[PDB]
Amino acid sequence: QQQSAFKQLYTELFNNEGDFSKVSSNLKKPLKCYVKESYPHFLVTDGYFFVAPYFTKEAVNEFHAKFPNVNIVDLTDKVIVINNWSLELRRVNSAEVFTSYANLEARLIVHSFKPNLQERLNPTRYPVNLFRDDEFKTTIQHFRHTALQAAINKTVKGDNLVDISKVADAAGKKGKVDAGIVKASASKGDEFSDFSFKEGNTATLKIADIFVQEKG
Amino acid sequence: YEYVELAKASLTSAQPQHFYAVVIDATFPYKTNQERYICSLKIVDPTLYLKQQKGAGDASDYATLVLYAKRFEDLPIIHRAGDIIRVHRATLRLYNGQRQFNANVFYSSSWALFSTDKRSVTQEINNQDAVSDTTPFSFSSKHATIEKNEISILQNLRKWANQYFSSYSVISSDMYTALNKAQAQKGDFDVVAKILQVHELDEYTNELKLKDASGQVFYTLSLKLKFPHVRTGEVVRIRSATYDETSTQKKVLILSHYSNIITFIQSSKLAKELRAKIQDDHSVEVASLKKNVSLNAVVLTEVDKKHAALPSTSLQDLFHHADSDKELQAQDTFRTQFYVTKIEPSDVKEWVKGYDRKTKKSSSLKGASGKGDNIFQVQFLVKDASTQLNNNTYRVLLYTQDGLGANFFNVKADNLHKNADARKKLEDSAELLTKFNSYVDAVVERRNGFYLIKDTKLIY
DNA sequence: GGGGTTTTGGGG
DNA sequence: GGGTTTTGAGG
DNA sequence: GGGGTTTTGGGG
Ligand SMILES: [Cl-]
Ligand code: NA
Ligand code: NA
Ligand code: NA
Ligand code: NA
C-alpha cells in the first residue's frame, strides 16, 4: 500500500498512458499538502515527496479574490488545500526542469486552492524530489521502454540480418561501427518521440509572473 | 609546526593546535546556508582509537573533526576510510563527553590528505601513480608543505593504520545498523554492506545493490560524479541513510546531500571478512521474473572470469566514437551493458541456421541438415543509458560459426524446427531478454564494423 | 596578530 | 557538530 | 582594503 499520495497518483498516470480519466476515481479527492517552498520554485509536499503545482490564470485570480490579505509567493511553511486539480503528461527538457525525468513530466494542474493559514502540520521525513525517486524513475523508464519497444517492432522489419559472410573471414575486412546503428522509429529529430499518449496542453503561469503581480 | 596526539591535545589552551590522524568516517562536504559549508569526520590515532575494552565490546573510540569553509572546494572529500589527514591550527574543546577539534578553513585553518595505501581512491580510479609517499593527494589552500621531520610521523602513522585496520574492525557494530532492522529506525542510520551490483540507471545516477551481514538486500541511488569509486564486490560504509516507506516493490535506502559512501583500505579486516562472508543474492531477480512488470533490474548474463577486470564501454562510445577515438580504435575487445529491445530474426526457430564453411553462407534448417553445420545467427537490437534518449537502437551480433558466444544461451546450436526442448529454452530466453528491466553484461569483439558477443553466458 | 596583498598605514 | 543547499543530476 | 577575529590600532 503506497503511503505517498503523489507517488501513487503520478505512477498510475504513467501506467495509464497519461490518460487522467483512467486513473482511479477514489484518488481524485481534495489534496491537502504542505508548502515547502514558494519562490523561486513553488514546491508542495504530501509528507514524503514534493511536486511543483501549476496554477491556471483562473485559480490565482480566484485566490486573490477570496483571500486579499494573502500572497501566494509567501505561502512558504504554510499549508494549502487544492480542491480542484488535474494531472497531465508533458514533454520537457529534463536538463532544465528538475521536476521532470527522461524529458517527461507529470504536472499537477491547480484550478482552485485554499490557504489554511497558520495550520501546523505533523512532523515528517525530509521531502524529496519525486522525479529523483528510484521507483518512480524506473516507472518512467518502463513507460518509455514500452513506447520504444512498440515503435521499434513497427519500424524494424524484414529481418535485415548482417550477412554472416561479413563477420566470417574478416582477416582483410574493415568496417565502420556506425553500420550497426538502426533507427528506432520515424521520429523527425535525433531524439526518440514516438509516444502514443497525447501530450496534455493547458496554459499555466510562470512563478515569476505571479511574483510581479504581487510586487512589481 | 608542532604536532600533538589526539589524546594529549590541550582542552584548556584553546590555542590553535596541529595534528596527524586517521579518518575512519566522514560526511560529504555539504552546504548549510547561503555562505557556509561543513564536513564532519571521525578521527583516530595511536593514543585514541578504542574504548576501555572489558565491557566496551571492542567499540572504537575517537575524536571528531568539524571543518568549516565558505566554499565546497575548500573541504576534504573522504572516499575511503583509513587514509591520513594533517590539520593545522585547530581549536579543541569537549563536546558532549568527547574531544572535538574545530577548524575554520575559511580563516587560518588548513587540512591535507595523505594516502595510507599505495594510491589514493582517485588515483586508483584513473590508474595513476602517486608523486611520492610524502605528497598529499588533496589539501586546502593553494600550497602544502611537508618538512623532513614530518616524514617519520607520516610513515609511522601509516604503519599503525594498517596494523589497526587488520587487527580491529574500526567501524564497530555500534557504528551502523543491520539492513534487516533498518525499518525500525526513527531516522537516519549507517550501513556496512557489500556492493553486489552497480546498475547504471541513467546518465548521472547509479543504482547500488547492497547486502550486509544480516543477509538483507537493499537498493540505493548513488550519483556517478559524487561516488565514482563504487565497485561491485567491494565493501563500503554508508554514512547516513534512511528507510524508504514509499518503496513497496523493493527495499530502498535514501541518501542525503551530506550522506557518504566510504570504502576501506587494503588492510581492513572488516572489509576482508565481509567480501568473503557476504555472498551474491539472486532471490530478488528470480522473484521478479514471475511478475509481468519488475521495478527491479535483472542482469541476465555473466562474463567470463578473465574479463571481470575489463572496464565497460557505453554504446554511445561503441557506435559513435569507436572510429574517431584514439583509445577506442586500439581495442578490438570490449565489455558493455545494455538492454535488448528486439531480437532478429523474429522467429526463434530461425535463430539457428545451417552454415557452409566453404561458401561462407548460412541457410534455414526448415529443409533439414542439407545446409551444413548448425550455428547461431542472432542479431540483437539494443539500447543503453548513454543512448536512452536518441532515436537509435544498436545491433549486437551473436554469430557463433567461429565459436564466439556459442554457449551464450547455455543451449548448443541445433535444428530448432525439430528439437522442441532446444526451441522452448530459447523462446523463454527471448521473453526474458526483451522484458523491461532486463539487461545484458557482455564482452564483444569488433569484427568488420560489427560487435559479436563472446565469453558471455546467461545465468537465468 | 597575522594572511595575502598593495592597502605599504589604517576600518569595522 | 548525527547535518538540509540549489549548483535544484558532488554541494 | 577587507576577513576573521579580538588585535578593537597597528606589522611586515
Ligand atoms: Cl573493423
Ligand atoms: Na592588515
Ligand atoms: Na597590508
Ligand atoms: Na581586528
Ligand atoms: Na587587521
Helix-strand layout with pairing:
The complex is a heterodimer of chains A (216) and B (460).
Chain A: H1 5-14, E1 31-37, E2 43-45, E3 49-51, E4 53-55, H2 57-66, E5 79-91, E6 104-115, E7 128-129, H3 134-155, H4 164-167, E8 181-183, H5 209-212
Parallel strand pairs in A: 3-7, 4-6
Antiparallel strand pairs in A: 1-2, 1-5, 2-3, 5-6
Chain B: E1 17-26, E2 30-31, E3 37-44, E4 63-69, E5 80-81, E6 84-95, E7 98-104, E8 110-114, H1 121-125, E9 138-139, H2 148-167, E10 189-200, E11 205-212, E12 217-223, E13 235-243, E14 252-264, H3 269-277, H4 283-288, E15 298-299, E16 301-303, H5 315-320, H6 326-329, E17 333-344, E18 352-356, E19 361-363, E20 373-383, E21 392-399, H7 420-434, E22 438-447, E23 450-454, E24 456-458
Parallel strand pairs in B: 4-7, 5-14, 12-14, 15-22
Antiparallel strand pairs in B: 1-3, 1-6, 2-3, 3-4, 6-7, 6-8, 8-9, 10-11, 10-13, 11-12, 13-14, 16-24, 17-20, 17-22, 18-19, 18-20, 20-21, 22-23
The site of chloride ion has 3 residues of chain B, from loops.
Chain B binds three DNA strands through strand 2, strand 3, strand 7 and strand 14.
Keywords (chain A): Chromosome, DNA-binding, Nucleus, Telomere
GO molecular function (chain A): single-stranded telomeric DNA binding
Protein name (chain A): Telomere-binding protein subunit beta
What is the alpha-carbon Rg of chain A in Å? Answer: 23 Å
Strand content of chain B: 35-45%
Proper CATH architecture of the largest domain in chain B? Beta Barrel
Oligomer: heterodimer
CATH topology heading of chain A:
Telomere-binding Protein Beta Subunit, Chain B
Domain count of chain A: 1
Q: How far apart are the first and last residues' alpha carbons of chain A, in Å?
A: 46 Å
Query: How many beta-strand runs of chain A?
Result: 8
Number of domains of chain B: 3
Largest sheet features of chain B = 8 strands, mixed
Count of helices of chain B? 7
| Beta-strand percentage range of chain A | 15-25%
Lateral strand order in the biggest sheet of chain A: 4-6-5-1-2-3-7
CATH class of the largest domain in chain B: Mainly Beta
Which architecture name of chain A does CATH use? Answer: Beta Barrel
What is the helical fraction of chain A, as a range of percent? 10-25%
Helix content of chain B: 10-25%
The CATH class designation of chain A is Mainly Beta
At the fourth level of CATH, the homologous superfamily of chain A is Telomere-binding Protein Beta Subunit, Chain
Structural class of chain A: alpha/beta
